[PDB]
């Protein structure tokens, strides 16, 4: 009966195109039931997503994950995510479309309020325009948003009452409760897409890039790191070479097209550059990094780490200080210079790889689907010599 427990399948009766986009997105796959990466961490940090009364294994509190990953379950104070479509559907139509007023993530006493807790919620759907039809009433597909139930194809559709809310729906208020920041228990940022967005100074709403008008309405696919086309668009990558004595001076230019860091969001996202010089038989003559750049060429590893009081790497739950951050900064163009011995080199090839998880985690959790965990080739540049 309450709007937040209405299944996305009901909406799909009249918004099939948006439904199709949404259903394939990580928003629809956000729960520990549907995303095996999040599920592995949820099991380790909280417990079974098919159990009621679960708490965080350290804090003993209602699991904070759910505020962002299973909003309608958190709205109903339940941890049993398989009990109802409102919970299995993750960040679903009504989860986003019942957010009314964004209060910010930090309250006046400094308490962090995540996900649905950063908002006043409505029992009415919230829309960018709604149906401002008072003038038409004053003068005087089926639409269930006009104050009454409607019949569709012989089936009664309940009233799905709606309010216009342009400031919520058209600005970053639509995203920030879940995407601004998340800190560990010592206050260290884990995710910090909002602080990055502030620092970089952009005035573009997340939707302008992430909900583009295509085919005449706002695209709900909202792909990021799970979507290779988006990742290839997300940077400009180029390789230049000049002669330099008996070396080849190779310049790798990487421009971040985003107003947040690249890669933003989860702390384990990372990129790395492989730059390789080959002879004319295709045999390797030189490489920037023999194996993984994190170990062999740190300037070519673009990542965030956390640290202990000593500055040394620490697991995210116990870290007390940010570690180094070599990710591309908002709208940054990074130049990396290499000096390659020229003898026999016929081809210099640069490759930029994106990864959902740190290599430590990929090496450990080898039962995760290999399609998830494999490096993603997101840019290539070749120069013949
Ligand atoms: C038909 C029986 C519908 C059902 C079921 C739902 N909606 Fe709807 N919606 C309907 C119409 C005819 C329209 C107008 C435009 C169109 O697509 O033909 C809408 C519009 C919306 C909007 C946008 C309003 C705006 O600002 O322009 C939203 C945000 C919306 N609808 C959401 C929504 C949700 C979340 C649903 C399930 C809970 C849902 N609608 C069902 C018709 C029908
Ligand atoms: C948050 C991640 C959302 C989810 C999940 C869904 N919608 Fe959405 N929708 C959202 C925003 C912020 C906006 C406004 C975009 C802007 O910047 O203007 C919308 C818009 C709609 C519309 C209007 C589309 C248009 O006329 O171009 C409709 C009809 C709509 N949304 C419906 C809808 C349905 C049916 C969903 C589940 C399948 C759904 N949305 C999920 C934010 C989010
Ligand atoms: C265009 C100028 C953008 C604006 C405005 C914002 N984002 Fe973005 N974002 C953009 C691209 C091209 C990509 C792909 C790169 C990628 O890493 O996937 C992204 C990606 C994200 C992601 C995924 C990050 C990851 O794990 O790799 C998220 C969570 C994201 N963007 C969020 C986001 C939010 C909340 C925004 C407004 C504050 C926002 N983006 C603006 C391009 C653009
Ligand atoms: C909480 C209720 C959210 C709101 C509101 C928005 N997003 Fe979201 N987003 C959320 C989660 C929990 C996740 C990850 C789920 C998982 O298990 O991986 C996401 C993910 C994204 C992504 C990345 C998609 C990918 O390919 O991995 C992007 C680009 C994204 N979200 C964008 C985005 C925008 C632009 C929003 C406002 C319009 C928005 N999200 C709202 C949780 C929530
Ligand atoms: C909102 C403030 C969130 C809270 C609280 C938690 N998570 Fe989350 N998570 C959130 C978003 C917006 C995203 C997408 C980030 C991006 O870069 O695109 C995520 C992602 C994850 C991931 C990665 C999932 C994947 O790549 O498929 C994991 C492993 C993850 N979150 C786990 C997790 C757990 C275990 C939480 C509670 C302890 C938790 N998250 C909370 C937003 C939010």
8 A C-beta contact, residue 208 and residue 174: no
Asked whether 351 lines ligand 5 (CB < 6 A), one says no
Which atom of ligand 4 has the smallest separation from the CA of 223? 26
Strand residue runs (E) in 261-384: 270-278, 284-287, 301-307, 321-325, 333-341, 347-355, 376-384
Which atom of ligand 3 has the smallest separation from the CA of 176? 35
Residue nearest to atom 38 of ligand 3 (CA): 206
How far, in Å, CA of 353 to CA of 380, rounded? 9
18 phi and psi angles, rounded to 5 deg: -70, -40
What angle (nearest 5°) sits at the alpha carbon of residue 123, between those of residues 6 and 61?
80
8 A C-beta contact, residue 326 and residue 301: yes
What angle (nearest 5°) sits at the alpha carbon of residue 289, between those of residues 285 and 291?
105
Between the two ends of the chain, the Cα-to-Cα distance in Å is 69
| Domains parsed from the chain with CATH numbers | 3-177 (no CATH), 228-384 (2.60.40.2360)
The neighbour count for residue 184, using CB atoms within 10 Å, is 17
- Strand 247-256 and strand 235-244: the pairing is antiparallel
How far, in Å, CA of 197 to CA of 359, rounded? 27
Q: Of 230, 228, 235, which Cα lies nearest the Cα of 210?
A: 230
8 A C-beta contact, residue 22 and residue 217: no
Q: What is the largest CA-CA distance in the chain?
A: 85
Q: Is 325 left (phi over 0), alpha (psi -120 to 50) or beta?
A: beta
Residue nearest to atom 41 of ligand 5 (CA): 65
The neighbour count for residue 328, using CB atoms within 10 Å, is 23
Alpha helices for 148-279 (secondary structure H): 166-170, 176-179, 193-200, 206-210, 228-233
Please enumerate, as own/partner, the contacts of 215-223 that have beta carbons within 8 Å and a separation of 24 or more: 215/17, 217/17, 217/18, 218/18, 219/21, 220/18, 220/21, 220/22, 220/25, 221/21, 221/22, 221/24, 221/25, 222/21, 222/25, 222/26, 222/27, 223/25, 223/26
Is it true that the peptide bond before 263 is cis, omega within 30 degrees of 0?
Answer: yes
Task: Indicate which ligand has the atom closest to the C-alpha of 79.
Answer: 5
R_g (Cα) of the chain, nearest Å: 24
Residue nearest to atom 4 of ligand 5 (CA): 65
Residue nearest to atom 42 of ligand 1 (CA): 143
Asked whether 224 lines ligand 5 (CB < 6 A), one says yes
Residue 62 burial (CB < 10 Å; 0-12/13-18/19+)?
middle
Residue 259 DSSP label: S
Residue 313 DSSP label: B
How far, in Å, CA of 56 to CA of 65, rounded? 9
Asked whether 85 lines ligand 1 (CB < 6 A), one says no
Residues within a 6 A CB radius of ligand 2: 8, 11, 15, 18-19, 22, 27, 91-93, 96-97, 128, 169-170, 174, 207, 211, 217-218, 220
Residue 365 DSSP label: -
8 A C-beta contact, residue 70 and residue 83: no
Alpha helices for the chain (secondary structure H): 8-11, 16-23, 36-45, 66-69, 71-75, 85-88, 93-97, 134-139, 166-170, 176-179, 193-200, 206-210, 228-233, 293-296, 359-364, 370-373
How far, in Å, CA of 270 to CA of 265, rounded? 10
């Amino acid at each position: 009966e309450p709007i937040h427990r209405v299944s996305s399948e009901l909406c799909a009766n009249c918004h099939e195109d948006i439904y199709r986009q949404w259903k394939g997105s990580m928003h629809a796959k956000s729960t520990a039931l549907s995303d095996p990466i999040h599920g592995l961490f949820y099991q380790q940090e909280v417990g079974d997503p098919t159990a009621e009364g679960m708490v965080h294994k350290k804090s003993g509190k209602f699991p904070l994950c759910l505020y962002c990953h299973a909003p309608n379950a958190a709205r109903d104070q339940t941890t049993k995510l398989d009990a109802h479509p409102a919970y299995t559907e993750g960040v679903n139509c009504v989860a986003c479309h019942t957010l009314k007023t964004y209060n910010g993530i930090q309250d006046a006493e400094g308490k962090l309020r995540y996900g649905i807790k950063a908002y006043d919620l409505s029992d009415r759907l919230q829309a960018p325009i709604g149906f401002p039809r008072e003038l038409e009433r004053l003068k005087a597909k089926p639409n269930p948003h006009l104050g009454e139930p409607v019949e569709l194809d012989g089936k009664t559709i309940p009233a799905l009452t709606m309010e216009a809310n342009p400031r919520q729906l058209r600005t970053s208020d639509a995203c920030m409760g879940c995407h601004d920041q998340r800190d560990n228990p010592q206050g260290v940022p884990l995710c910090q897409t909002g602080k990055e967005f502030i620092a970089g100074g952009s005035q573009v709403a997340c939707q302008t890039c992430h909900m583009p008008v295509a085919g005449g309405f706002a695209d709900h696919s909202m792909g990021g790191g799970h979507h290779e086309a988006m990742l290839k668009r997300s940077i400009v990558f180029d390789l230049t070479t000049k002669a330099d004595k008996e070396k080849i001076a190779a310049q790798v230019w990487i421009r971040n097209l985003q107003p947040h860091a690249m890669p933003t969001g989860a702390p384990f996202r990372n990129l790395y550059l492989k730059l390789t010089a080959y002879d004319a038989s295709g045999e390797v003559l030189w490489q920037n990094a023999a194996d993984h750049p994190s170990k062999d060429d740190p300037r070519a590893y673009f990542a965030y780490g956390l640290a202990d009081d000593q500055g040394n790497p620490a697991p995210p739950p116990t870290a007390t200080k940010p570690g180094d951050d070599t990710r591309l900064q908002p709208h940054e163009t990074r130049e990396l210079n290499y000096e390659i011995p020229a003898k026999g080199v016929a081809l210099v090839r640069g490759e930029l790889y994106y990864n959902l998880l740190w290599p430590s985690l990929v090496e450990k959790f080898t039962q995760l689907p290999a399609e998830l965990t494999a490096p993603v080739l997101i840019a290539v540049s070749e120069k013949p010599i």
